[PDB]
């Protein structure tokens, strides 16, 4: 994973996202959704999804939330106050903690001013607590600004490392982007049916066709402008739409 003071930032993009494999995986110790309850994720579409990744202590997972304070949310990773995404977290004691102490996971514990939301700060200047200038050397009131979790496998819970992923769905002003997945059923031919073909809503009997649709078209229409043929996605085979039986 990535440190807590330099988190990562992956920009998931146009794709088919299935938040159900996440939501029901039961391997996550924390799955909170803020802008939007979890079950309705696989039914919405946004412009961009960002995924941020890092590693913190066990009892610091309550500062990854909109409107908190503490050494993590103050100056390591700040979430805006109208967050939209979801926060996922799971214990990782066996991967990240090693006997003798894993001193490779640092965090920032001194900063001049709290972070703006989603702001990032990887500098390593000597902090200056008191009024006396520091001149790049340590001493009283001149402190190195980074500390390291010394993780060890015999730590009580709440001191073992947790890995965190923060998904943030954003909606700029584009034309569209990634969203939940679609589900198609079987093809029942020869029965007055109520159908939807990726947007085309209608009723009627569906029948095998013999018309030769171009190499880019979708459906077919007739004079007086009524839909009378469609193309199925799963297979891509011409099909006619005959009105029902009335009289």
């Amino acid at each position, epitope marked *: 994973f990535a440190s807590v003071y330099a988190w990562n930032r992956k920009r998931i993009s146009n794709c088919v996202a299935d938040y159900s494999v996440l939501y029901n995986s039961a391997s996550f110790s924390t799955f909170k959704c803020y802008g939007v309850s979890p079950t309705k994720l696989n039914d919405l579409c946004f412009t961009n999804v960002y995924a941020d990744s890092f590693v913190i*202590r066990g*009892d610091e997972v309550r500062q990854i939330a909109p409107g908190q*304070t*503490g*050494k993590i949310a*103050d100056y390591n990773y700040k979430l805006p106050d109208d967050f939209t995404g979801c926060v996922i977290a799971w214990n990782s004691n066996n991967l990240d903690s090693k006997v003798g*102490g*894993n*001193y490779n996971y640092l965090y920032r*514990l001194f900063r001049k001013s709290n972070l703006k939301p989603f702001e990032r700060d990887i500098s390593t200047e000597i902090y200056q*607590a*008191g009024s006396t200038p520091c001149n790049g050397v*340590e001493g*009283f*009131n001149c*402190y*190195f600004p980074l*500390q*390291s*979790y*010394g*993780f*060890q496998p015999t*730590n*009580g819970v*709440g*001191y073992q490392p947790y890995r965190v992923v923060v998904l943030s769905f954003e909606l700029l002003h584009a034309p569209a982007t990634v969203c939940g997945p679609k589900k198609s059923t079987n093809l029942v031919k020869n029965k007055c049916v109520n159908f939807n073909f990726n947007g085309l809503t209608g009723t009627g009997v569906l029948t095998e066709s013999n018309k030769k649709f171009l190499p880019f078209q979708q459906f077919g229409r007739d004079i007086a402008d009524t839909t009378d043929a469609v193309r199925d996605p799963q297979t891509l085979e011409i099909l006619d739409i005959t009105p029902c039986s009335f009289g």
Partner: antibody, heavy 127, light 108 residues
Framework: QVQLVESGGGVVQPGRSLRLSCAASGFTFSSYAMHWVRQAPGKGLEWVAVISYDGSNKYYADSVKGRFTISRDNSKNTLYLQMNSLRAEDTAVYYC????????????????????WGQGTLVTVSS | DIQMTQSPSSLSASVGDRVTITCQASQDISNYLNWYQQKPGKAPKLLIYDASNLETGVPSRFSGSGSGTDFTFTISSLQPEDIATYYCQQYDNLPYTFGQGTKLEIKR
């Protein structure tokens, strides 16, 4: 398991010198930190001194400096506070406690501070 | 670097009530502290790490609230064996200052 024992205090005249003993048990001693804290009888607690995992990081308090010194034995799981130039005023009960959360001190943050398994007093009169 | 904390010291209430102790912190904002109880004739004892999140053994009648420069210990549902002092230690510098204590007394 984790418990501490202390000895070395008694009655002595002012101006003299005395060293204490703060021993450990159970846990690994040379990874933690060790604090020194006191209270004059009938008053509140007061932090006295601290040292890292034998890394020579004292950062003493006010007045205390130049009169106190810290020495721990990582090999024998013991810790000694030696004080010189007494004032006939620092007569108190004294406690040593473990830390795992300081900044320029012990590597990595581990557990809670100040788990407080000590005791032991010292009288400084003329009787 | 000199800081100090305060306390509404020397309170008194009865069985089955709620008490509050407010350690207001000095300048140079900090980040969580602690809460100790001290039965007299003995050694102190940890109850709550920085801000909140008590430890083990504690009968879970205790709560903190850490928000910068003013922290409030809050105990609910008093019990007839929980009268002692209560000194809070603040950390994050060279000199780890303390509070002043809070003596407790029943009602007769």
């Amino acid at each position: 398991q984790v418990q501490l024992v202390e000895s070395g205090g008694g009655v002595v005249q002012p101006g003299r010198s005395l060293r204490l003993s703060c021993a450990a048990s159970g846990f690994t001693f040379s990874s933690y930190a060790m604090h020194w804290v006191r209270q004059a009888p009938g008053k509140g607690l007061e932090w006295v001194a601290v040292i890292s995992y034998d890394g020579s990081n004292k950062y003493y308090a006010d007045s205390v400096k130049g009169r106190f010194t810290i020495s721990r034995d990582n090999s024998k799981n013991t810790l000694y506070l030696q004080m010189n130039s007494l004032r006939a005023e620092d007569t108190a009960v004294y406690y040593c406690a473990r830390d795992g959360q300081a900044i320029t001190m012990v590597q990595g943050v581990i557990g809670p501070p100040f788990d407080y398994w000590g005791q032991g007093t010292l009288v400084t009169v003329s009787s | 670097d000199i800081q100090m904390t305060q306390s509404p010291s020397s309170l008194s209430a009865s069985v089955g009530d709620r008490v509050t102790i407010t350690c207001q912190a000095s300048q140079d904002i900090s980040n969580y502290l602690n809460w100790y109880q001290q039965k007299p004739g003995k050694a102190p004892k940890l109850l709550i790490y920085d801000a909140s999140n008590l430890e083990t053994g504690v009968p879970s009648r205790f709560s903190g609230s850490g928000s910068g420069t003013d922290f409030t210990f809050t105990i609910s549902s008093l019990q007839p064996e929980d009268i002692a002092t209560y000194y809070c230690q603040q950390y994050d510098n060279l000199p780890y200052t303390f509070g002043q204590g809070t003596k407790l007394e029943i009602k007769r």
